[PDB]
Structure 1
Amino acid sequence: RTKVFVWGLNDKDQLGGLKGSKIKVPSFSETLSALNVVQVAGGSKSLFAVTVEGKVYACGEATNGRLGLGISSGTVPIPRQITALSSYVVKKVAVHSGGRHATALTVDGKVFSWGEGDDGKLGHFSRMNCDKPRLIEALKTKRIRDIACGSSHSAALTSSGELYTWGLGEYGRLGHGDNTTQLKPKMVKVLLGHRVIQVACGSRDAQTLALTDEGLVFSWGDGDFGKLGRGGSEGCNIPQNIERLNGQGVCQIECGAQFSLALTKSGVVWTWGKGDYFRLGHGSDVHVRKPQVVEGLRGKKIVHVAVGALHCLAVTDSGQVYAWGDNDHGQQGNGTTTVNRKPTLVQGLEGQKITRVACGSSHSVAWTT
């Protein structure tokens, strides 16, 4: 048993079988709970679930083939198995909250991609859409250990610690010293000598974040609103160290819409970037151009975080979920459509020891184990 709870926008049934378009309180998902999930991931009006068995299920908007079910137009209102992957044990799905493509990493290190093909983000030397998952041949000889997707580019990292990026080159998000689109996975040579252990990719005019095993956080790409974390707004196409987070013990990095977030081993949350609609959690909607601790969570040991487009979720070590940011569709889980300017306890989960959260563009997920 893993109980799964969902809330937020439900216009395309991206919550997997609830009635109503704005679910304002976390609601038990019997379809998703029945699956025994190890991971839920949220994309643009879409939801993906990876089970202990290693299968993948998807629901929500099917346009551009987000869901990898061989279709391209309508809605999948009930979570449906991506049967193209039924012969593999999938370990993780990577998708951005504002994304229309995704990747899947198997336990034996293979990477499949599917969905919108613009700018080569699927990694098959073309700009073609893929309605069904397709193996990224370029990575077949690398033992990939993690994956990440933005709205317009993608990334993967090997067990030796090398980082690959591909997709839209504009504004330097790929990190290769130019702005050239890569239809193929390309190694970030500037980071050799560092063992990269996570990577996160942003949306639209996007940033990229990387984390090394020594705790170093790097950022590059678009610089608007200070989401690179080094002040001002100048972009770059070469990875640069975010000096402020050195020595902080960062263990998880995420990119929402035009903002960045980091969580540390000791349980503190840092955010920076675009401030509009209170996505940063500092109580105001001003921009923050170097990382700043979310004071609203000081004293709470956060063990897992997730970012949507305009909202964030954080779980304490005691199973409590806090949310902050925009609430046009109920994604805050406070029973209303009122913004959470500061981190706020999510209603309706008491007695559920949540261990993990996930976000899509405008929806939210929490689950136990």
Structure 2
Amino acid sequence: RTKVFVWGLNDKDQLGGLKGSKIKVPSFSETLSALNVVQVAGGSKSLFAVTVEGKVYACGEATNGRLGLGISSGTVPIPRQITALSSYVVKKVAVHSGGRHATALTVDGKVFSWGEGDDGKLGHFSRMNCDKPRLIEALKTKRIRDIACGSSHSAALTSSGELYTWGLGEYGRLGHGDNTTQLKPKMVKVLLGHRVIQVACGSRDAQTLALTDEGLVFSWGDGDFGKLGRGGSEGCNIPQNIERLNGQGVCQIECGAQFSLALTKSGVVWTWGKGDYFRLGHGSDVHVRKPQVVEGLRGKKIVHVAVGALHCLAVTDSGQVYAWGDNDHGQQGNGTTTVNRKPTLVQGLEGQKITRVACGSSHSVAWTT
């Protein structure tokens, strides 16, 4: 039994079966709790769940085929299974919080993509949309161990540590030294000789992050608001090391809208980038152009984080969920629509030892094991 809780925006039933549009307090999801979820992932007004059986369920806005259920208009208000993937064991779904396309990675290392096909982010040597998932033929020969999607590009990394990016080339987010759109996965040759073990992709004029098995964090792409983490606002189409995070023990990296977040093995959260609407968690809405420790969580061992467009969630080792950022749609889970300028204990989860959070554009998810 895996207890799942949702809140935030529900205008397109992306919360999976709640009445109302601004769910302001976490709410037990009967649909999602029944599935026995291993992962929940949130896209643009969309929700995905990977069950312990390896199946995938989707709900939310159907526009652009973002749900992979064979339709490209309307809404799916009850989680439905992505039967295209029924004969595979899916281990993970990657979607950006402001995303209209996604990928699924199977346990044997095959990768499927579906949704909006603009700028080639699906990886099928085209710009076609895909209403149902399709095997990224280009990666058949590679054992893929992780995936990430931005709003306009996608990434996959192999067991050996090589990183592939593809999709919209503009502002250098792909990391190949030019700004050329890539319609098929292309290997980031600069990161060879580093074992890349995780990657994260942003939205709109986007950055990209990579993490190596030695703790090194790399960033590239759009530089606006200092989201690349090296000060100023200069973009870069070549992966550059974020010197400040070296030796910190970074173990997870995420990209919200125009900002970056890192979590360390010892439990520290670092954020940087665009500060508007308090998405960084430092108590003010100024930009932060090199990574800064989120002081409001000092002394709380954070074990899992998730980022939406303008909000963050962090789980403590004791099962408490802290949120910060914008609250126009109740995604803070403080029972109001008041912004959390600093990390704030989420309401209505006491007694529930939460181990995982996820976010979509303006909604939130917490669940147990």
TM range (shorter): over 0.9
Q: CA deviation at 1:76?
A: 0.1
2:9 aligns with 9
CA-to-aligned-CA distance 1:128-150 (integer Å, 9 cap, x gap): 00000000000000000000000
- Show CA shifts across 1:82-101 (max 9, x none): 00000000000000000000
Matched, 1:81 2:77: no
- The CA deviation string for residues 34-87 of structure 1, in whole angstroms up to 9 with x for no partner, is 000000000000000000000000000000001000000000000000000000
Report SS of the residue matched to 2:12.
coil
Deviations 1:99-146 (A, max 9, x none): 000000000000000000000000000000000000000000000000
Distance 2:80 2:170 in 1: 35
Work out the CA distance in 1 between the residues paired with 2:105 and 2:214.
Answer: 24
Distance across 2 between alignment mates of 1:347 and 1:94: 27
Once the two structures are TM-superposed, the CA of residue 348 in structure 1 deviates from its matched residue by 0.1
Q: Which SS does the other structure have where 2:113 is aligned? A: strand
| CA distance, structure 2, for counterparts of residue 19 and residue 251 of structure 1 | 37
Question: How much does 1:194 deviate?
Answer: 0.0
Per-residue Cα deviation, 1:182-239 (whole angstroms, up to 9, x for no partner): 0000000000000000000000000000000000000000000000000000000000
1:157-204 deviation digits (Å, cap 9, x = unpaired): 000000000000000000000000000000000000000000000000
SS of structure 2 residue aligned to 1:49: strand
Q: CA RMSD in A?
A: 0.2
CA distance in 1, matches of 2:86, 2:303: 31
The CA distance in 1 between the partners of 2:332 and 2:195, in whole Å, is 36
Alpha-carbon distance between aligned partners in 2 of 1:266 and 1:336, rounded to the nearest angstrom: 32
Q: Distance in 1 between matches of 2:211 and 2:231?
A: 19
* TM score, norm. by length of structure 1: 1.00
Q: What does residue 111 of structure 1 align with?
A: 111
SS class of match (1:31) = helix
Q: Name 2:336's counterpart in structure 1.
A: 336
Separation of aligned partners in 1, 2:296 and 2:99: 29
Partner of 1:227: 227
Shift of 1:341: 0.1
1:294 shift after superposition: 0.1
**CA separation in 1, counterparts of 2:346 and 2:363?**
13
Q: How far does the alpha carbon of each residue in 1:332-351 deviate from its partner, in whole angstroms, 9 at most, with x for none? A: 00000000000000000000
Deviation at 1:327, TM superposition (A): 0.1
Local SS of the residue matching 2:35:
coil
SS class of match (1:239): strand
Q: 1:324 aligns to what SS in structure 2?
A: strand
Deviations 1:16-35 (A, max 9, x none): 00000000000000000000
In 2, Cα distance between equivalents of 1:276 and 1:2: 35
TM-score with structure 2 setting the length: 1.00
Unaligned segments of structure 1, at least 5 residues: none
What SS does the corresponding residue of 2:138 show, helix, strand or coil? Answer: helix
Residue 14 (structure 1) shift: 0.1
Corresponding residue SS for 2:155:
strand
Q: Which position in structure 2 is the counterpart of 1:61?
A: 61
Q: Distance in 1 between matches of 2:123 and 2:319?
A: 38
Q: Distance in 2 between matches of 1:280 and 1:305?
A: 13
SS in 1 for 2:119: helix
Q: For residues 254-277 of structure 1, give each alpha carbon's deviation from its aligned partner in whole angstroms, at most 9, with x where no partner exists.
A: 000000000000000000000000
Q: Distance in 2 between matches of 1:65 and 1:326?
A: 28
Task: Spell out, residue by residue over 1:297-344, the C-alpha distance to the aligned partner (whole angstroms, 9 max, x if none).
Answer: 000000000000000000000000000000000000000000000000
Q: Secondary structure at the match of 1:34?
A: helix
- CA displacement at 1:279 relative to structure 2: 0.1
Count the aligned residue pairs. 369
Separation in structure 2 between the aligned mates of residue 9 and residue 29 of structure 1, nearest angstrom: 14
Distance 1:7 1:115 in 2: 24
- State the identity %: 100
